[PDB]
Design a binder for this molecule. Structure first.
Ligand SMILES: C[n+]1cn([C@@H]2O[C@H](COP(=O)(O)OP(=O)(O)OP(=O)(O)OC[C@H]3O[C@@H](n4cnc5c(N)ncnc54)[C@H](O)[C@@H]3O)[C@@H](O)[C@H]2O)c2nc(N)[nH]c(=O)c21
Ligand SMILES: Nc1ncnc2c1ncn2[C@@H]1O[C@H](CSCC[C@H](N)C(=O)O)[C@@H](O)[C@H]1O
Length: 260
């Protein structure tokens, strides 16, 4: 059993009050007061982020931890916060965004955020059985949380296997993907094998809530994986009992318009 496995059990052992107090303590949180209503008021001319995903990818890019360029695929695009972020980048030429949709799964939010015309959205698409195609940048933000850590590890393993498939098709592609449960031994094994072939490493974004162990893997960084995981597990376990709230920051606003 790992330190992260214990973090999960301690998380699930929280009372409701301890859970609410823990989940957002000390994390960055974008201010979505305007964004949120605009989206369900059906306003489509808006460049405010369609989800909390946009600020996470932006942070990775602005830190120099991901290379977004050329033809991008967004695997599991959901509402599309990563797709819109990618489309707004000048080095990005196009975005092919795929998501399953249906019951309990977000469909793409349709807005005129800068570069929207470079995105081809395909809902109803299962990326795990999709044939990989040409891509310069492969992104995947898939990983549904479960109170069962063994289910989280299996969900995570599936993402890593998917990224191996896309790398087999595109050995030179830049990759960035969610690693929902990096503390599971079966995940560590698959990540170490990924890293030995393709390089890369793991990083924690400051917007992730403490109720998730999610870390992001990218071929543009490096670092011992077990150390990265254990450092994060210790930091998560140290926040139990912390009273500070979240730190509110402005939401990303990419502006509106086409890119040609
Ligand atoms: C709601 N919730 C979530 N977690 C833990 O946080 C992890 C992910 O964090 P999140 O679940 O809050 O994030 P998400 O984006 O999914 O939003 P939401 O708040 O709607 O969470 C719903 C999920 O939590 C699960 N859940 C609901 N109640 C509990 C609970 N009492 N204990 C554990 N899991 C719970 C539900 O089955 C569902 O899977 C969950 O996998 C679980 O270990 C909780 N732990 C306690 N101790 N009490 C909780 O109320 C609780
Ligand atoms: N097998 C699958 N094929 C395609 N999409 C899937 C999938 N399994 C889960 N998904 C979708 O993957 C999405 C991940 S949500 C990621 C947030 C997104 N990057 C943003 O910035 O808004 C979810 O909407 C989920 O419905």
């Amino acid at each position: 059993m790992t330190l992260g496995d214990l973090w999960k059990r301690r998380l699930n052992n929280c009372t409701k009050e301890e859970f609410f107090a823990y989940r957002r303590t000390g994390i960055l949180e974008t201010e979505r007061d305007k964004a949120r209503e605009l989206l369900r008021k059906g306003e489509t001319n808006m460049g405010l982020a369609v989800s909390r995903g946009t600020a996470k990818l932006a942070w990775l890019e602005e830190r120099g931890y991901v290379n977004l360029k050329g033809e991008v695929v967004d695997l599991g695009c959901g509402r599309g916060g990563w797709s819109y972020y990618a489309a707004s980048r000048p080095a990005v030429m196009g975005v092919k965004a795929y998501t399953i949709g249906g019951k309990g799964h977000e469909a793409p939010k349709m807005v005129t955020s800068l570069g929207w015309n470079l995105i081809k959205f395909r809902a109803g698409m299962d990326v795990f059985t999709m044939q990989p195609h040409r891509a310069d940048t492969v992104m995947c933000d898939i990983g549904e949380s479960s109170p069962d850590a063994a289910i989280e590890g299996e969900r995570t393993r599936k993402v890593i296997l998917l990224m191996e498939q896309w790398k087999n098709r595109n050995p030179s592609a830049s990759c960035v993907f969610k690693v929902l449960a990096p503390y599971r031994p079966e995940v560590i094994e698959a990540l170490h094998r990924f890293q030995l072939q393709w390089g890369g490493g793991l990083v924690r974004t400051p917007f992730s809530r403490n109720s998730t162990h999610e870390m992001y893997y990218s071929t543009a960084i490096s670092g011992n994986i077990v150390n990265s995981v254990n450092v994060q597990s210790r930091k998560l376990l140290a926040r139990f009992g912390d009273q500070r709230g979240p730190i509110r920051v402005p939401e990303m606003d990419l502006g509106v318009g086409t890119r040609h």
